[PDB]
């Protein structure tokens, strides 16, 4: 047995969002436990042409024309801080942090390959060599066929037009679905793809997948093809660890199409919300642990409805990551990395422009010993002070996030609105990303001050007396 944790992905098609962007997202648990959030640029320079896989050490030959891409690194690993997600210079987004499920019937036919690729390799070997989400699908599929994989994975791709969800199937097979423009998906650590039309333009798969199913008695259904019925799981672990997370998201976006059983094994894959979806919505769902009277995590009653469902995106590590490819803006400022910051219950997402060659100084320094001029330690301070009397800080937490998002959006809007006469767009965007980093810091500083100010004024008469 080995490594890896719990993740929830939300995909939004370009007509399903409030601003016409595509959205792919994820929340992330860490394995060891320090979470300084960094984002990194990988220039064609730094891209290997003879790549060696992280766990398996197999050697992979990569094309010689890699695109610059921005990367979001991860946990403790067995070989270097591999990219979990990213946006390349063609505005293609990819995220490969969603472990899914399988079953023993297909594994008996196409087993995990112990010397295969793992999810740690996927962004590196796919993202720099494709100019569309759909190319991302075909290239990854072709690489699974060639090198195999030792894991069950779900991978999201997006560009300004399309969103694709790819699922690996056994050691070498795969299947993928184009999310409709007006649709959204909530996907936990369980194989998600349901009804599947091999003919469709909206689908892609191993060229032998249908024959693989038909010739080996893999299909449990009397009619049609449901890929997660065929290749996935419907286990006991799913009902408490995966399905309630799907259910919760679908209850939020589609309250009138979603019944009341968080354990349901056949919640639809593709959904239609009753309204357009914002970045704030996605952030909330990826942050929120089922909270209305039902399933806190936790407080006032019940706990006969509790302890045994799985919180999102809290257990914790709490990093929400949202990749947005916008429309109706010049293509050079379209790619946005909404990066987590962080941390505890005081996390926000900061909208960095992805189209840059260098990063704000904060994300290459240390992050050595405690220093309140450093964003990490300031966050840790705010985090720790937060659990003092935490529902004395619950209402100033919501104001903090609101006020910080507001400040981030002001910068994004001002930057977008003044793009037209700029002679150096890349430096222009570097400067915006540095304004964002600065206000993210200033906001948490204002937060530390407000907590201490009102805390010292409450602790003062939690000690009881006088007029």
Which residues participate in catalysis according to the annotation? 7
Torsion of CA 224, 226, 227, 232, to 10 degrees: -140
In 64-160, which ranges are continuous DSSP H helix? 104-107, 119-126, 133-147
**Identified binder of its own copies from the candidate list 40, 41, 81, 109, rule CB under 8 A:** 109
Which residues neighbour 48 within 8 Å (Cβ) at sequence distance 6 or greater?
62
For residues 74 and 84, the answer to whether their CB atoms sit within 8 Å is yes
Q: What minimum distance in Å lies between the beta carbon of 263 and its own copies? A: 6
In terms of phi and psi (left: phi > 0; alpha: psi -120 to 50; beta: otherwise), the region of 225 is beta
Site for Co ion in 159-218 (CB under 5 A): 180, 182, 199
Residue 409 contact, options its own copies, Co ion, none, Cβ 5-8 Å cut-off depending on partner type: its own copies
Residue 396 contact, options Co ion, its own copies, none, Cβ 5-8 Å cut-off depending on partner type: its own copies
Q: What minimum distance in Å lies between the beta carbon of 60 and its own copies? A: 26
423 near its own copies, rule: CB under 8 A = no
Q: Are strands 335-341 and 319-325 parallel, antiparallel or unpaired?
A: antiparallel
**Identified binder of its own copies from the candidate list 45, 50, 64, 104, rule CB under 8 A:** 104
426 near Co ion, rule: CB under 5 A = no
* Residues, the chain: 467
Q: What minimum distance in Å lies between the beta carbon of 112 and its own copies? A: 8
Q: What minimum distance in Å lies between the beta carbon of 319 and its own copies? A: 19
194 near its own copies, rule: CB under 8 A = no
Report the alpha-carbon distance of residue 388 to residue 82 in Å, rounded.
36
What CA–CA distances, in Å, run from 187 to 92, 97, 246, 247, 454? Answer: 20, 12, 6, 10, 40
For residues 356 and 426, the answer to whether their CB atoms sit within 8 Å is yes
237 near its own copies, rule: CB under 8 A = yes
Can you tell me whether residue 325 is helix, strand or coil? strand
Report the alpha-carbon distance of residue 148 to residue 459 in Å, rounded.
59
DSSP string, 387-456: TSSGGGSSHHHHHHHHHHHHHHHHHHHHHHHT-TT-S-HHHHHHHHHHHHHHHHHHHHHHHHHHHHHHHH
The whole-angstrom distance between residue 125's C-alpha and the CA centroid of its chain comes to: 19
Residue 399 contact, options its own copies, Co ion, none, Cβ 5-8 Å cut-off depending on partner type: its own copies
Structure tokens at 91: 């505005």
Structure tokens at 329: 């803006």
**Identified binder of its own copies from the candidate list 31, 61, 410, 427, rule CB under 8 A:** 410
Site for its own copies in 363-392 (CB under 8 A): none
Q: What minimum distance in Å lies between the beta carbon of 232 and Co ion? A: 23
How many residues make contact with its own copies (CB under 8 A)? Answer: 59
Structure tokens at 227: 């890929």
Report the alpha-carbon distance of residue 186 to residue 188 in Å, rounded.
7
Shorter beta-carbon distance to its own copies: residue 19 or 135: 19
Can you tell me whether residue 148 is helix, strand or coil? coil
Residue 222 contact, options its own copies, Co ion, none, Cβ 5-8 Å cut-off depending on partner type: its own copies
**Identified binder of its own copies from the candidate list 192, 246, 381, 412, rule CB under 8 A:** 412
1 near its own copies, rule: CB under 8 A = yes
Residue 466 contact, options its own copies, Co ion, none, Cβ 5-8 Å cut-off depending on partner type: none
450 near its own copies, rule: CB under 8 A = yes
Using CB under 5 A as the criterion, which residues of the chain lie in contact with Co ion when the complex forms? 180, 182, 199
Using CB under 8 A as the criterion, which residues of the chain lie in contact with its own copies when the complex forms? 1, 18-20, 33, 102-105, 107-109, 111, 217-222, 229, 235-237, 239-240, 263, 275-278, 280, 288, 291-293, 300-304, 308, 328, 395-396, 398-400, 402, 405-410, 412-413, 450, 454, 467
């Amino acid at each position: 047995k080995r490594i890896k944790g719990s993740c929830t992905s939300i995909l939004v098609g370009k007509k399903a969002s409030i601003d016409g962007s595509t959205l792919i997202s994820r929340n992330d648990p860490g394995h060891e436990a320090l979470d300084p959030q960094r984002f990194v640029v990988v220039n064609p320079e730094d891209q290997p042409r003879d790549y060696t896989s992280v766990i398996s050490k197999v050697n992979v030959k990569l094309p010689d024309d890699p695109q610059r891409y921005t990367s979001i690194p991860n946990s403790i690993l067995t070989n270097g801080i591999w990219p979990a997600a990213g946006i390349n210079s063609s505005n293609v987004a990819m995220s490969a942090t969603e472990t899914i499920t399988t079953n023993s019937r297909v594994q008996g036919l196409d087993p995990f390959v112990e010397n295969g690729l793992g999810e740690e390799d996927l962004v590196t070997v796919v993202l720099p060599y494709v100019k569309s989400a759909r190319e991302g699908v075909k290239r990854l599929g072709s690489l699974l066929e060639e090198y195999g994989t030792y894991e069950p994975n779900g991978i999201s791709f997006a560009d300004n037009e399309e969103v694709w969800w790819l699922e690996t199937i056994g050691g070498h097979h795969w299947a993928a679905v184009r999310i409709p423009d007006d649709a959204y998906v909530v996907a936990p650590n369980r194989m998600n793809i349901d009804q599947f039309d091999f003919d469709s333009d909206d689908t892609l798969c191993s060229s032998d997948l249908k024959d693989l199913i038909d010739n080996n008695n893999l299909n449990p259904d009397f009619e049609n093809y449901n890929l997660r019925h065929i290749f996935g799981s419907a286990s006991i672990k799913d009902t408490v660890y995966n399905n309630p997370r799907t259910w919760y998201g679908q209850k939020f976006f589609s309250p009138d199409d979603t019944a009341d059983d968080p354990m349901e094994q056949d919640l639809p894959f593709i959904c239609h919300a009753n309204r357009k979806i914002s970045v704030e919505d996605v952030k909330f769902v990826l942050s929120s642990h089922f909270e209305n009277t039902k399933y806190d995590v936790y407080g006032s009653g019940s706990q006969s409805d509790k302890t045994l469902f799985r919180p999102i995106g809290i257990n914790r590590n709490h990093n929400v990551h949202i990749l947005q490819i916008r429309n109706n803006v010049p293509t050079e400022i379209a790619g946005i990395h909404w990066l987590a910051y962080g941390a505890n219950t005081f996390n926000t997402v900061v909208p960095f422009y992805a189209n840059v060659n260098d990063t704000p100084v904060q994300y290459k320094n240390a992050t050595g010993k405690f220093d309140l001029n450093n964003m990490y330690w300031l966050s840790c301070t705010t985090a720790l002070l937060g659990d003092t009397d935490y529902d004395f800080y619950v209402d100033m937490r919501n104001d903090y996030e609101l006020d910080a998002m507001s400040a981030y959006r002001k910068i994004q809007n001002d930057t977008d609105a003044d793009i037209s006469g700029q002679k150096d767009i890349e430096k222009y965007l570097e400067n915006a990303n540095k304004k964002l980093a600065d206000v993210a810091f200033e906001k948490q500083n204002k937060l530390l001050g407000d907590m201490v100010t009102t805390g010292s004024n409450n602790m003062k008469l939690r000690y009881n007396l006088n007029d």
